[PDB]
């Protein structure tokens, strides 16, 4: 046991020395050569109303017009960004839903929560009514996040500190991702869907592969539980947000953080993070009844999106980058452009 | 300007909104309560009796008593980090806390169960989200405590205790100790009650507590309190 611990400590020290040697220059020194971005003004266009419970998850579709949102009332609503009309209303058997996902083609939707079971609902049913297609059971903890890898397979995150990849046609988990010491909170798929990063309460993120199913790399630096994690549009980096009131951008090739985002007046935790189409700007939902925009290159505050009357819980940028939706516990989802 | 399909979609959206409002108004009539306590605290017996009167994850029990609907949520089986999802129960009406009164001299793999139960009760009471939520303590092991105190003294658990070995004084001391853990007496209430073989008394006490809370909630909402 002692020899194994000494070997682990030596490997950790070697990894730290390597990460330090590879840090030839910081992102700030390189980004200081370009002028900063101007003041970004975003005015709320649509004010979606109809929810009677706190919002916790929302996701857009490939068409960049439909967005599915989940609430604690047990009703999944698919809103239309241009008309604000409800396309479907899925009644959940367990009202304690916490995560929701919208498949790329939009034919199926996934949801989960404290029930420890992920329900899949088909929207293109010939019967005409949205009915549960498959129930993925086996998780010993609440579902924190889930995303569609493909029309056939899906990935889900549970609070049992271990994730699993479930096949729809089969319904049995094929790959089991283990290694997290804390409960996994959020996921983020890469543009190629080959690798994905996952953050847990242990203040560290881990990269995982679909076919291999092994931890490709680990990233540390956080001081609290990582609540949100998003992939960079290029697929070579990813941002993470924890309760320490600061974001952290890590690179899959550098194996260390590039720049930190923080401000003295911010002392509250972060709930959601999402990049833009080009990644020039980053958005972060905070608990101070608003969200904040940061410069991905200079970390300068680009703007503040206020109006929500409760803790901001989720936010998502359209695939085309036209507008960005934000949902909070106040039961209202606002679209800014 | 809206075409036929647009008007039809708007009408369907209005109908869906009406249905959602009706569902919400119907669900608002049912009270919501959260059950907490150790597995050996008797929660199973309480749930069984409340169901008679009327797998991993959380359990949801429904029962009606005196024209009033209740939704008991049991999250004891969820052995994970509670501070990351307990906030979901912010809108809960009451918190039914069960503790093993007789399990004062046993050992658990704090070493003692009473200290852990008190710590959990204090953490749930002083929680930043349960500031205006009421807690109701239930002692489901009073008979075992009476049968054991005659042989095993209570001093083993509370060395500082020096009162009489009778059951009344010990019960009063335990009640005072569990009540002193409330650091927000000005904003919330703790309704204590001793459970026995009888079950209707506990249901009546829960109904009265839920009524007294709905009353205070309505008084705070209308602007009086």
């Amino acid at each position, epitope marked *: 046991l002692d020899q194994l611990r000494q070997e682990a400590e030596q490997l950790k020290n070697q990894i730290r020395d390597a990460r330090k040697a590879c840090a030839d220059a910081t992102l700030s020194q390189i980004t200081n050569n370009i002028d900063p971005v101007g003041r970004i003004q975003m005015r709320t266009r649509r004010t979606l109303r109809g929810h009677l419970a706190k919002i916790y998850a929302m996701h857009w579709g490939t068409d960049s017009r439909l967005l599915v949102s989940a609430s604690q009332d047990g009703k999944l609503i698919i809103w239309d960004s241009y008309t604000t*009309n409800k*396309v*479907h209303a899925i009644p959940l058997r367990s009202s304690w839903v916490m995560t929701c996902a919208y498949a790329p083609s939009g034919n199926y939707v996934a949801c989960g929560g404290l029930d420890n079971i992920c329900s899949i609902y088909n929207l293109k049913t010939r019967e*005409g009514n949205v009915r549960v297609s498959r129930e993925l059971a086996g998780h010993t903890g609440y579902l924190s996040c889930c995303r569609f890898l493909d029309d056939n397979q899906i990935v889900t995150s549970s609070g049992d500190t271990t994730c699993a990849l479930w096949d729809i046609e089969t319904g049995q988990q094929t790959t089991t991702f283990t290694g997290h010491t804390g409960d996994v909170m959020s996921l983020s798929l890469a543009p190629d869907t080959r690798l994905f990063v996952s953050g847990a309460c242990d203040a560290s993120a881990k990269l995982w592969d679909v076919r291999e199913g092994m931890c490709r790399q680990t990233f540390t630096g956080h001081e609290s539980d990582i609540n949100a994690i998003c992939f960079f549009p290029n697929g070579n980096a990813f941002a993470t947000g924890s309760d320490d009131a600061t974001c952290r951008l890590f690179d899959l090739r550098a194996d260390q953080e590039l720049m930190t985002y923080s401000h003295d007046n911010i002392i509250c935790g972060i709930t959601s993070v999402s990049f833009s189409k080009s990644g020039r700007l980053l958005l972060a939902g905070y608990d101070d009844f608003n969200c904040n925009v940061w410069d991905a290159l200079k970390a300068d505050r680009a703007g503040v999106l206020a109006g929500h009357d409760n803790r901001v819980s989720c936010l998502g940028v359209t695939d085309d980058g036209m507008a960005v939706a934000t949902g909070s516990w106040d039961s209202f989802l606002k679209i800014w452009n | 300007t809206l075409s036929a*399909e647009d008007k039809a979609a708007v*009408e369907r959206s209005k109908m869906i909104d009406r249905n959602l409002r009706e569902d919400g108004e119907k669900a608002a009539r049912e009270v919501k309560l959260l059950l907490l306590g150790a597995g050996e605290s008797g929660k199973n017996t309480i749930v069984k009796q409340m169901k008679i009167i009327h797998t991993t994850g959380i359990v949801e029990t429904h029962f009606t008593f005196k024209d009033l609907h209740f939704k008991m949520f049991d999250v004891g089986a969820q052995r994970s980090e509670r501070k990351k999802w307990i906030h979901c129960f912010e809108g809960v009406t009451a918190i039914i806390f069960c503790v093993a009164l007789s399990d004062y001299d046993l050992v658990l793999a704090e070493m003692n169960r009473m200290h852990a139960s008190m710590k959990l009760f204090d953490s749930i009471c002083n929680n930043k989200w349960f500031t205006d939520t009421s807690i109701i303590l239930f002692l489901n092991k009073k008979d075992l405590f009476e049968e054991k105190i005659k042989k095993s003294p209570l001093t083993i658990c509370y060395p500082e205790y020096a009162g009489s070995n009778t059951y009344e004084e010990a019960a009063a001391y335990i009640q005072c100790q569990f009540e002193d853990l409330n650091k927000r007496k000005d904003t919330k209430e703790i309704y204590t009650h001793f459970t026995c073989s009888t079950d209707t008394k506990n249901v009546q006490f829960v109904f009265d507590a839920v009524t007294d809370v709905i009353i205070k909630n309505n008084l705070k909402d209308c602007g009086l309190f």
Partner: single-chain antibody
Amino acid sequence: VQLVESGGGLVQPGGSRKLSCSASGFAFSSFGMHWVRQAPEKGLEWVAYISSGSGTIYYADTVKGRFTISRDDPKNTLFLQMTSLRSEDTAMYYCVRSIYYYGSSPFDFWGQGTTLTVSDIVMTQATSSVPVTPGESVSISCRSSKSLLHSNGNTYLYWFLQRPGQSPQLLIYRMSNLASGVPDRFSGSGSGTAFTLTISRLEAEDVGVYYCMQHLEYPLTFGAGTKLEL
């Protein structure tokens, strides 16, 4: 999904008939119903329509006020009271489902209909009969009096294929989305008022009549219909 109609037969002009369509196997409440008649050797024609929850009911000028379409969702049955009957009302009435939402495929299912015997944007198809052998591609042109392209950015157009002894089948809706279950051989395009339905390779199953429909407004109008036979 199955629709069975009842009511009809020989009815004098002064008589009345209550046509009843039994709906089952789908959300009848959420899906509205359209009545489309088809007289002998004549094109289709819209009769009436009821919206979800009986909130909006419309009638065509040819039947406005005379006929009465009602809806029964709890029973899952559609009813049509026909008080007066004229010498030209004889036609097979077909019930068609229609749901309205972003990405919907209304008028996808057509009922078997019932035979009843009694003792506005203009749509026109260039060619009516185009004899062609299987294997060779086919093209059916259509023209609308009014521009169907709406300011939203879509074109309200529908094509229906009716085979001998079978009800019409929705091929393409909105001029840009292929109906579910239809082969990919069919394609539709258009610009403003001139539209074209192309078929890569004609087959025996394609034998039938193709009817066009515009859905820009309430008064739906159907064309003469282009028939294809090997």
